[PDB]
Amino acid sequence: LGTDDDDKMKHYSIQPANLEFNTPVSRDFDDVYFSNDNGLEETRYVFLGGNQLEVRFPEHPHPLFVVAESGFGTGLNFLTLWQAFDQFREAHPQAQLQRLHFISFEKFPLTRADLALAHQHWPELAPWAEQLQAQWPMPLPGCHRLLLDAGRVTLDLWFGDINELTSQLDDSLNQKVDAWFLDGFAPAKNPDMWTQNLFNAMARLARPGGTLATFTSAGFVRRGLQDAGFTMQKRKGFGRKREMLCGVMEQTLPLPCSAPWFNRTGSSKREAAIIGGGIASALLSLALLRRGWQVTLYCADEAPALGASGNRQGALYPLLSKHDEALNRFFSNAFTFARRFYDQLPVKFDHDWCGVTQLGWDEKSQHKIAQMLSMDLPAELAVAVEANAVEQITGVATNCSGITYPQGGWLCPAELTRNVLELAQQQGLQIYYQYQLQNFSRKDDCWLLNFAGDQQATHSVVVLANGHQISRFSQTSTLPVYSVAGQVSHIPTTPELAELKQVLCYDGYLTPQNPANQHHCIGASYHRGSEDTAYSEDDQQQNRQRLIDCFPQAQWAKEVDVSDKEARCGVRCATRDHLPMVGNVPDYEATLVEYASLAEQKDEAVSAPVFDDLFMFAALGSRGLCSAPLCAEILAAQMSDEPIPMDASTLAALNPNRLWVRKLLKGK
Ligand SMILES: Cc1cc2nc3c(=O)[nH]c(=O)nc-3n(C[C@H](O)[C@H](O)[C@H](O)COP(=O)(O)OP(=O)(O)OC[C@H]3O[C@@H](n4cnc5c(N)ncnc54)[C@H](O)[C@@H]3O)c2cc1C
Ligand SMILES: C[S@@+](CC[C@H](N)C(=O)[O-])C[C@H]1O[C@@H](n2cnc3c(N)ncnc32)[C@H](O)[C@@H]1O
Ligand SMILES: [Cl-]
Numbered sequence: 001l002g003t004d005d006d007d008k009m010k011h012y013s014i015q016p017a018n019l020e021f022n023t024p025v026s027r028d029f030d031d032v033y034f035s036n037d038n039g040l041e042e043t044r045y046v047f048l049g050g051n052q053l054e055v056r057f058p059e060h061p062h063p064l065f066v067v068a069e070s071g072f073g074t075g076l077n078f079l080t081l082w083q084a085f086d087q088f089r090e091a092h093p094q095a096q097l098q099r100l101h102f103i104s105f106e107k108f109p110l111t112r113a114d115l116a117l118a119h120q121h122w123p124e125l126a127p128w129a130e131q132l133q134a135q136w137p138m139p140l141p142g143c144h145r146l147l148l149d150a151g152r153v154t155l156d157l158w159f160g161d162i163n164e165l166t167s168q169l170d171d172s173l174n175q176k177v178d179a180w181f182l183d184g185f186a187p188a189k190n191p192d193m194w195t196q197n198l199f200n201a202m203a204r205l206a207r208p209g210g211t212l213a214t215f216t217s218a219g220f221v222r223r224g225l226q227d228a229g230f231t232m233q234k235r236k237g238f239g240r241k242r243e244m245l246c247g248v249m250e251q252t253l254p255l256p257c258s259a260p261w262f263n264r265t266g267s268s269k270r271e272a273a274i275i276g277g278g279i280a281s282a283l284l285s286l287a288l289l290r291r292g293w294q295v296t297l298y299c300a301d302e303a304p305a306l307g308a309s310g311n312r313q314g315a316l317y318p319l320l321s322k323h324d325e326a327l328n329r330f331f332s333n334a335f336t337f338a339r340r341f342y343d344q345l346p347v348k349f350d351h352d353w354c355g356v357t358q359l360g361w362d363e364k365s366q367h368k369i370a371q372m373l374s375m376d377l378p379a380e381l382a383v384a385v386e387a388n389a390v391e392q393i394t395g396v397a398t399n400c401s402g403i404t405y406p407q408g409g410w411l412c413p414a415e416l417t418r419n420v421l422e423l424a425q426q427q428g429l430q431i432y433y434q435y436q437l438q439n440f441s442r443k444d445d446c447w448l449l450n451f452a453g454d455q456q457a458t459h460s461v462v463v464l465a466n467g468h469q470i471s472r473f474s475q476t477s478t479l480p481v482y483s484v485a486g487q488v489s490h491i492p493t494t495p496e497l498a499e500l501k502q503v504l505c506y507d508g509y510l511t512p513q514n515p516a517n518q519h520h521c522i523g524a525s526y527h528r529g530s531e532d533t534a535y536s537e538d539d540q541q542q543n544r545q546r547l548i549d550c551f552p553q554a555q556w557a558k559e560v561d562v563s564d565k566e567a568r569c570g571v572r573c574a575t576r577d578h579l580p581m582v583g584n585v586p587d588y589e590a591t592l593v594e595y596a597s598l599a600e601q602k603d604e605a606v607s608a609p610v611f612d613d614l615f616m617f618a619a620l621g622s623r624g625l626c627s628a629p630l631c632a633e634i635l636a637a638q639m640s641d642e643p644i645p646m647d648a649s650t651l652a653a654l655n656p657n658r659l660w661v662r663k664l665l666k667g668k
Helices: 005-009 039-051 053-059 076-091 112-119 123-135 162-168 196-205 219-228 279-289 325-344 363-373 387-394 413-426 467-471 537-550 588-594 624-640 648-652 658-665
Strands: 064-070 099-106 142-148 153-159 177-182 206-214 231-236 243-248 271-275 294-299 314-316 356-359 383-385 402-405 409-411 430-433 437-443 446-451 456-459 461-464 482-492 503-506 508-510 519-523 567-574 581-586 610-618
Touching (some): 039 053, 039 177, 039 206, 053 076, 076 099, 196 219, 279 413, 279 610, 294 413, 294 456, 314 325, 356 363, 461 624, 467 567, 482 537, 503 537, 508 537, 581 624
Parallel strands (some): 064 177, 099 153, 177 206, 271 461, 356 503
Antiparallel strands (some): 142 153, 231 243, 314 409, 356 402, 446 456, 508 519, 581 610
């Protein structure tokens, strides 16, 4: 034992569908995706009509409707639903139902090319089809979220085998699905996907009273779903087909609580105070406002992005890893989500998706790159680059190989934070600057916040998104986060340095010029356990010098000029395991008492001891531009008892009580 023999069976890319036309036909399955002339009206009859969506929409007593689907395929069901939802909202703008959520699972996703071709056969759907195509995700495993129409429609595509994926979903998703679209290839010649495990999962995820519909009337499917707990009914088939099936969950099933120590719970309340001013608090605000939360932001400073989020140019690429499975999945999916989110964001901020190139300057660095190169990632995520091609790619001669992230680049985090915050204010965010939270206590049924002035406010929900100062409250004092101060030097461009087309990562990082500035940013110093933001001359020199040590023959590297003493200093908040800390704020003392002997009383274990209606968005390290968007989704979903776009184990890797609970589990 102890060998890497497993690695040859692991895959970090999902493979696309083998498509042909005549209508899209699957080569692998020898079936059509849908029927030829009548595909659109059949879709409306089977999936919309069989779940009685038109009747239910105007009386639906929740602001969200959640449809879940087996087998996304062409997207026809999704597009047809969206169209119907849009028509519903126009006819009944006063209805409580304001937002659509669609969760689909897909083993063989279409390429962007095939998807665009499939959609050509339905010019009626083109306004919706085009928006889908604009965000169609890179085929990586697991959950991919697309905010469509500014969050009015949300699409979670889970890439992989549906029968592997269903047991990977978080508990939060149970009893949340209003309607099932049980699609797939005709049972009698894809029996493989129509399993009991599938039907049971559908039953688990179904809201009590929730529906399902399907095209087939195969006996074994009817009985399988009855055994899962749905009340099933035969209804007339569209066209030639004599019969289809629909069902209702007419009972309340026992709610699952495996791993209660990782329970992500939400809140019933809809007004929140956020303690922040940085990227995290900014993106969170958007995510909460689009759901009709009342949001108040408090910031200690005179203006926002004076914390760690205040640089002029930060790099955006994912931290990949061969050994940390959860770190790799998080950053890969956060990264591509971050790119879609930033593309869609109606806010001006200086950026350029010019690519990021990491360089093998060292034996130690070549080896970390080689580790990453030995995973089969899609080229669109990360791809090797020879030494000869590096100069063509980056613009500069580095004299060594590397790996490039072609969808990566730089953005201006200070401006992004300010302009997002300014958008949130137009959407209703109340900001109070020069409000430094000292304290908060539970009074009656509110959180009482005490600011440094004898100022007080009361709020229903409090979210701590205050960077390195996260652990300065008694209810947070024992979080395993630590401060890392650092300095990024601002440098003028030269003729040699104006040739840089990309962000270079080495023992440090160098951005290309911001053409509006004629300046690059180059960093960064790393001071573990320091909260000191004073300008350091040694750090400044060292930001130049590290670059020169990595590429000793590079005449462009010597043209870096730090003599202006221009720099920016901030304090990162990090964890040993490099993942964020996002979720309920855990009660340390109550965790330790309640899970004292957890190593042998797992079965009787209570829900994770947390503070009520108190959340945190924290520890973004030096990769917050990459991680904040998806973390904003996760937290705001969790807070709202809405579908979280991540698998259970990656969520557990992001839970704030994780260190304590890991030790307590193993008895230590
Ligand atoms: C040197 C350096 C280089 C970096 N390089 C990169 C990079 O290349 N790529 C990248 O993606 N990221 C980079 N980062 C940033 C990293 O992503 C940070 O972790 C990120 O900016 C964290 O943002 P935040 O919103 O969590 O916290 P912050 O930006 O630190 O914001 C904290 C906010 O909380 C407020 N606050 C604190 N205490 C209180 C209080 N008690 N009451 C009210 N308000 C309070 C502060 O006013 C502040 O506005 C870098 C950061 C540094 C310092
Ligand atoms: C009939 S198509 C789906 C319908 C789609 N909305 C359309 O109109 O084109 C069937 C889909 O099921 C998918 N599928 C088959 N087995 C699967 C599995 N085990 N997990 C996830 N998807 C699967 C296929 O990839 C295919 O995309
Ligand atoms: Cl930055």
